[PDB]
Amino acid sequence: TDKEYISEEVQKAIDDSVKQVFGIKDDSSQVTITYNKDKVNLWTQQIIDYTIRGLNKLGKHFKYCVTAILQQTNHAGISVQITAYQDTATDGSLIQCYEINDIYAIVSVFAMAV
Amino acid sequence: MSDSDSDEGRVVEEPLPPHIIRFNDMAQHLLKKVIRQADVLIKENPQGLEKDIALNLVKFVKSQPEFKIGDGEWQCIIGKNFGCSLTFDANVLAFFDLLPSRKSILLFKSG
Amino acid sequence: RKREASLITLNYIKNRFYPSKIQKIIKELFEDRLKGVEYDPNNANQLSERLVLELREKIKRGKVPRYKIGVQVVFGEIKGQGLRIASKCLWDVQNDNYASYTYTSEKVYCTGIVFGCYFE
Amino acid sequence: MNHEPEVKATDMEEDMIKRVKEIAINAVKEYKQEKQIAHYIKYEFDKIDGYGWNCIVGRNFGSHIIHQTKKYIFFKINELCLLLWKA
Amino acid sequence: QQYKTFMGARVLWPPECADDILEGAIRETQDALKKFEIAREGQKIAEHLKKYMDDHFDPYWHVFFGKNFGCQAVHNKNRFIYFYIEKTAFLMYQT
Amino acid sequence: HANEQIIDMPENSEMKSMKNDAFSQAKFAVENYKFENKISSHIKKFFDEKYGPNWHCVVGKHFNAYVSYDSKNFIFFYEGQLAILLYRKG
Amino acid sequence: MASEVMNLSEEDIQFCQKAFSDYDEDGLGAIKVSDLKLALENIGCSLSENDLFKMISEVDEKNTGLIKFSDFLNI
Amino acid sequence: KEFNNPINFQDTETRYGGIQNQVVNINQYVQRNPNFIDLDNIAELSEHSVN
Amino acid sequence: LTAQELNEDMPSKMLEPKNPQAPKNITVYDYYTRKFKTDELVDQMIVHFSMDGDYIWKESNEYKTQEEIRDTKKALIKEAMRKQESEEPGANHDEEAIKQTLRNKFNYNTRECQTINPSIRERGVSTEPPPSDTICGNITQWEIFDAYY
């Protein structure tokens, strides 16, 4: 429990990164972000910094790998499949799909036993 | 109808020279035609000025019928090492490097 | 070489080349599985997951049993839409390596990322 | 120290040629990357010369591109060649 | 500055060159030495390695190998390989 | 005593100073620095400012190397006991 | 394992002579000193520099093993 | 004592990822009359000194 | 940015966010600087696939610029078609022909420019230090005296 991977903890870390970059969350929020070639490069690096830092703050002794993909406002068919080779009791892999107005992004977190 | 094997091939008939594509914002049929002409042109005058090779390539694409996307005049720049950013007509820019030649070729139309 | 022997004691590592060996293996596997470039239908999306499952087994076969392999396969349709995917993974520097291969057809783009972490 | 660039050949106005050289000196120091230098010149020229512009910086390259009359200037700095044309 | 031994050859533990290419280059250099000794007709073995690099890697590779030498050079990302075999150090940077 | 050297530089094309600069720079740099790694960095830096970038120079008392260089940009000379090789590629 | 190779006998025999001469000990191994013993006994060369020159040129050397025999074979 | 890896590490778990569908046009016009693309034919160069 | 303590007092090691595979340092020559410039700090971020596309949303800032370019080209085409139609009697020239007609040898000039490049050459140079010889010297009081005498 104290040093055991939790699916709920991983989801909150990804949520903090999405909120930190552009999310004021539902009501009392006035954010309209449009994907741009210059902006997308900055967003992937910035989002990765927040997810790793957010995971690390409450992080246990687990190897962490994070992959970020930004969809170009949908209008195409994209399917992402995640395969992880790790002891089931020791680790779990969670993939989260986020809808953020004009730009759609998918965040995947990999947990490795240490 | 052909030496060794009868009726040739749909794939066997067309051979493409080895090349590396940095970016390919153009129709596949148009890009394949340009690569064959570029490889033949370089082969015709090896160790020759890039400007001379570029002039022949620009004439060939312009001369061929149904290869015109309109807007800006067709213009191709060939340099072993060069860095640039040019506004171009949508789906009219082809960028490729021939592996044997080892020289990057840039073809696009700017209006 | 007492120091070299000492280096084995802190971490065995078993650092078999993984930068292009996995990349060469994934690239060869992706071309055969992709088959026709033109197909991009809704029914094919279910089929894309099947390709990912086959890929993980091949990584273990190519001298990677000691390492733990995490592989993510993304299948998308490109109509000139621009999307950039960047992956950052925290691992013991020089004790782990990853292989990434990107294959783009005229109408279909397939990207496979493989992550290997040493464990014992 | 970087001396003022010498233009091998150009088709520009006396007032216009000075502006290109002035923009070129600022662009080279501001961006180390060759592509970045080309990107800066095109954007600055867009406000002054309108929507259509193109900038290419190559240490060694040879090519011929159609350009609008009086809008084409080519200047070579020490050990570097920069070519910019309009439409 | 921390030297490491891989595949029987001493090279920088953090490898400037790609892991795939670096292993191939080290194996080729060892095979070349097994055939031609560094001490006699040493110039010929270095030339053979340079030609071999062009066949399987991007062209204009620069190869310098000497018992004792000091050099600093500008190379492309993941195109610099430095390793020591016995008492001889081989340094190659791709341009 | 530098009995045999290889000279491949332009003569009377106004690039005559490159050969002269290489001999002068090597003698001044080698005596003051007195380090094989330092000599290569100093010779490369002086040549880079005067004739532009993409210049690679390696200095070793005893070494064997094979490299591709731009025509008329490669000069090989011996400064005292030390041997210095400088050439321009790209 | 020979394969049809005549070659000279006068020299091939000489090596064996000088070899067993110092190797008579029957130790089964050869050192860098033994190789010079012969030339030191008869006085073939003036200094070890000579024998060491050719030998060193062959490839490399060490303390003692057996391959040292090459010294005579090449001598 | 020091780390060992005798415990079995053979389990694999896979979780699917998907994006909810929407009209393909999505109030957008495909491409542009003029397309701007930046292409670099020169690889990045890093200088390392080994003595 | 955390450190993991190895069991049985092993040498300490820690994990880092930075990707090891990415080049340790990136150096780009600056013409203004006139000397090679090296930046130790790197982005250290890895992207498996990067895609740039020409997709624009309705009423975008970029879209307005594109509309202006189309209008400016259309205005020149409209003026050229109208002037030719006005100048001639009952002109039947097509819009596509007028666009081709608008381009003129004086109107558009094409020049091909190339940069001189030295031919690449491959040369092999071998250096080998002066031959060294072994010298043995024995000095005795009588020998020193004999030379002195």
Numbering used by the authors:
A (entry chain N): 4 to 117
B (entry chain L): 1 to 111
C (entry chain O): 13 to 132
D (entry chain M): 1 to 87
E (entry chain J): 16 to 110
F (entry chain K): 4 to 93
G (entry chain R): 1 to 75
H (entry chain E): 12 to 62
What does the paper say about this structure?
Thousands of outer-arm dyneins (OADs) are arrayed in the axoneme to drive a rhythmic ciliary beat. The tail is permanently attached to the MTD A-tubule, while the head region of each HC contains a microtubule-binding domain (MTBD), which binds and releases the MTD B-tubule depending on the nucleotide states. We reconstituted the purified OADs onto MTDs to mimic native arrays and determined the structures, by cryo-EM, of free OAD and OAD arrays bound to MTDs (OAD-MTD) in two different microtubule-binding states.
Cryo-EM classification reveals that the OAD arrays adopt two distinct microtubule-binding states, MTBS-1 and MTBS-2. In both states, the relative axial positions for α- and γ-MTBD are fixed on MTD (γ-MTBD is always 8 nm ahead), while the β-MTBD position is equivalent to either α-MTBD in MTBS-1 or γ-MTBD in MTBS-2. First, an 18-degree rotation between the β-stalk and β-MTBD is required for microtubule-binding state alteration, whereas β-MTBD remains in the high microtubule-affinity state42. From MTBS-1 to MTBS-2, the α-linker docking groove on β-ring is also switched from groove-1 to groove-2. Fourth, the tail of OAD is rotated downward with respect to the head from MTBS-1 to MTBS-2. Therefore, the β-HC in post-2 probably mimics the state after one complete nucleotide cycle.
